[model samples]
Target: QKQQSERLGTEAIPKLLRSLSIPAMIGMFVMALYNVVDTIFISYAVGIEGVAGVTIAFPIMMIMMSMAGALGIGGASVISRRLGERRGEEANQVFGNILTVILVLSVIGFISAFTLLGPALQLFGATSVTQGYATDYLFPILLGSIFFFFAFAANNIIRSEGNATFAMVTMIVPAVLNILLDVLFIFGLNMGVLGASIATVIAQASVTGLVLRYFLTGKSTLSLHWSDLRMKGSVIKEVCLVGLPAFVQQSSASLMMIAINSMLLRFGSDFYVGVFGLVQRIMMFVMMPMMGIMQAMQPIVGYNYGAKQYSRLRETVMLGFKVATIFSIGIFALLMLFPEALLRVFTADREVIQAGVSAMHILFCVTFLIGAQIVAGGLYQSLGKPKQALILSLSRQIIFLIPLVLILPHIFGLSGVWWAFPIADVLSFILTVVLLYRDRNVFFLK
Candidate 1:
């Protein structure tokens, strides 16, 4: 199977990448727009406090996503490697095992989060004014957490099996549906935060059910067979080992948001919190291309690496880095050119725009450096070098960003918080270069 995958390396690689990237980009845009529209509607109807409420619950939302990534990426890496090695039966078993893992984790997370709702929100920066709104938005999302984990995990499995187009379809269908329902629920039904939550829940559930139906029906190379659903300790351990760093990478960002939200509340006001949220939304848009490219690059790099196609692996990694750098340049240009215009998409207020303008500029100053870090990290993950990937993730969030977020604010006040991300990204980029240099041999075809 490994040699079989390698046989198509020359022709299939580029074509697969292009096909995957286009739809992946579309899916990312649709998903990002869902959040953007939710924010736009909430801001118009409920003001900065509404935005703050959503912002407070954002970390919890990411915690759910982190679990999904843990299962999705972990399972995908194993499945992809198995396929590369021509072990179809073993890959199917992994698919089953991953589903079981997701189910168990989802139930645990849902119960724990539901029971600890009050304290959790309090820890996440909920205030009296925003608490009710947070509760309104968060509870339904918590109830539907299984939908997120299952849908996300299944989607990764599809992508890993060389069905990137299917993966993109799964993401796009639900995202588009969520947007339409968001408008209907929020305005047509006058549901407010509850409406937004319902839209998300329905969309998530729809995708989860649809994807599971496909797998259960055995339409693809991989399927979740009950008879194969027994956990292998080594397989589970490998999954966690490869996946935990990504889990940390994602969760750390959520943690940074919590810190930023709490600190912004102290130094500024709801307005500042809202500005941070707006900046984050814009950043999401700007980063989407790099994300799309990096995601598309992962399977190629991983497949080639596993097949010992050292030269092709190196080529793919370099290609990813170059494309991401170019994308980052475009993002910087957008920020410099239309800071006010982008801010207007989130809030109509001139004050918000002014504060956000400063924040956006500062946040994006070192944005290009992040390209190296993301690509390098993705390369490490693709090659099954999770420790290196994990270290790179920690260097940015924990080693550099956390300290910068803490100390910068004391010196620069509110502006310090905004600058911390760029500083961390730059520092992480430097570290990624060091690590990539050390592991250069690993990227070569075996």
Candidate 2:
């Protein structure tokens, strides 16, 4: 674990972030490719309604992802902090609790989703024409929820253990497998959305295996054993409290995506949903390096904070902000300067390209303000300041972004949706500044 920590700082931070984030970015961009692939395959088979059907099922998928992250992030935070403080026994206990939480929560999620499938899709704004596709997409994903949860939860724990590369590999390896299976099942077997879902399930299962293998092989600090499964209410409560912020932030993003997709469907059509997904994928690709950098910084921040190295914590935060800002600026330039060039990768349809091109450029306008929020949020969460972190995170997405998303489109049209993001980003940046100002003293001690 010590070697892993050193590797993350000295060897991994520089080259690995560049190497891993780029491929991870491309791998994420393949998400756009997944949208494109799904669209192309389904369109050839069923047309626009097929695309619409899949989009309708998207929110439920987000809901699943939220649950996964809720448990994963919350548990990982506790584990990292305990490990950083060298409280190995406590870390082991936390890991055991998290593992149990994951299994129980996944079962609950699976049942809930299974029982509520019809209403959930209806609530997701599914139309009759798209209902079949939506059902096809949702049912399989709901069944595979456990695998997804385990994979993500394990990856988060791995990352917290200072094995970020292993975490990255776990995520990417499954994605690669999914891509191949997507081609086989969708194109070769003509399975459509069912095929896509099958590919996802296989990929998720593979990654879960990889993660479990790592821990069981004794490479990880926290071992997974049936005998170690202990549930202490106080420890669980603490983990949940500290983790609630990340849970809220993560879950909020999923809900927001659902709202955006539904609203887009109302104002425009399925093409618009595809356009939004495409632009988001492209943007994620551009933004992932910064995300990776921030993720890398979290363990370092948490470890040092636990160890009471205040100056090192401050130094890491400052450096993280600098790196994030520089990267955002470069991406912003590329986006504004060549929107069509990026959009063309997703689709060559003139209307789709045109819609996404403008959306991408405008949506990222306030990305320059994002660095402060990233650093601030990471700092707060790493130090176990969940309430403060949650407040700051939700301010952008829910408090600012949601209302803006709701009203801006009605007043301005589809363009309004695109504009809401940057506005929220800028406002959140200001709030971040205020919070930092208030909390400035904490960074100076020790």
Candidate 3:
């Protein structure tokens, strides 16, 4: 385990990055496919209303993920550095605190979802047309929030300890299982949206079991201990502060979803909401590879930063940025060329396809540049600079996208909403570059 920690500092940049990132990329790619598969199943099996229902419930789900990520990524950041510094005992304690925090937060999330299901769904733009399906789906999912939180939060720790292959397995198991279950429950059993929700939770529970076992059985360098489970304020504070940016990024995405859904409801129809949902899922697919690269970069950057290998750190970030840019540009070109063909995979509805084609083109126009912004934010988080990361993360969604979603829709109507995405992308990209340049002397030069 100590040798693994030492290799992060000594290994050649390209070889080390591929060793760490490929597994993470594959794992994250499969993880992102979970939503795409769910949308496809629900869209085909349950119809447009079903798709919209899941769409309405999507933001709440993102919030759950965001909460998990905040703790997971935050914990991973600290744990990676601790391991780099050869503080294995403290890393284990941090791991324990992360578990405690995830459980506590999960209970709060489950309760809040149950108590506020109706209003929350409504707030997220669920209408009379889609409320029943949304309620049915979200109820089961909320009940299983603990599983989602545990599996997701712990996977970060697994990756942080340089166990990327095990981490990859954790995600692949759930993703593959979820797809099979989605087909069985939704199609085989003819269970509809509720079936999809059940499949999701069951898959999450499976992942939770796998990750928990890994942590408890000494398979990981950062093992869990009963003694370390008690909450420590300073440790909790450190984890939250470091992880806060990821929470902000994901929560802002949740907020953006709420805003977009509400605007879609007002400007268009429920069907349009379903179209946006499809686009969002497709976009997730398009960006998942880049995200995989980002995930691959995180632990390396975090580890090297802790080891004070600034040159290697800078090289890793640049390579990640370049790969992400090329990937994003490729996805952009593909979407532009075949938007309708892609949208048709989810549904055969002509109206939805036509609307989605235009929206997809507009939304992803500046997506080629989004890679830079994402990599830049990951760099900040890896270096334990959460404030900069939080600012950059929020700039795209909260500072730019939300406001654009609110204002532009009123001006251009439905088209305005779609345009807001790329516009925000461009603005955020500029902001990211400016910030990176400002910090170059510290991050790159020295």
Winner by TM-score: 1
Question: Which run of 10 residues does model 1 get worst, by summed lDDT?
Answer: 1-10
| Model 2 lDDT tens row, 38-136 | 566666756777677777787677676676676677666676676556576676677777767777877876787678888777775567767778888
lDDT of each: 0.73, 0.69, 0.77
Per-residue lDDT of candidate 3, residues 169-199 (tens digit): 9888888998998898998898888888888
Q: Model 2 has how many clashing residue pairs?
A: 0
Q: Considering TM-score, which of the candidate structures 2 and 3 is the better prediction for this target?
A: 3
Q: Which runs of model 3 end up more than 4 angstroms from their true locations?
A: 1-10, 124-129, 228-230, 266-269, 343-365, 404-415, 441-446
Error of 1 at 52 (Å): 2.3
Clashing pairs in 1: 308-445, 308-446, 309-445, 310-444, 310-445
TM-score per candidate:
0.89, 0.86, 0.88
Worst 10 residues of 3 by lDDT: 1-10
State the lDDT of candidate 1 residue by residue for 38-101, as single tens digits.
7788887677787888888888888877877877788777766665554666666777777777
Number of clashes in model 3? 0
lDDT of 3 at 244: 86
Task: Predict model 3's lDDT versus the native.
Answer: 0.77
CA displacement after TM-score superposition, residue 81 of candidate 2 (Å) = 1.4
Off by over 4 Å in 1: 1-11, 44-47, 231-233, 267-269, 343-359, 410-422, 442-446
Q: What RMSD, rounded to one decimal, does every model reach?
A: 3.2, 3.7, 3.1
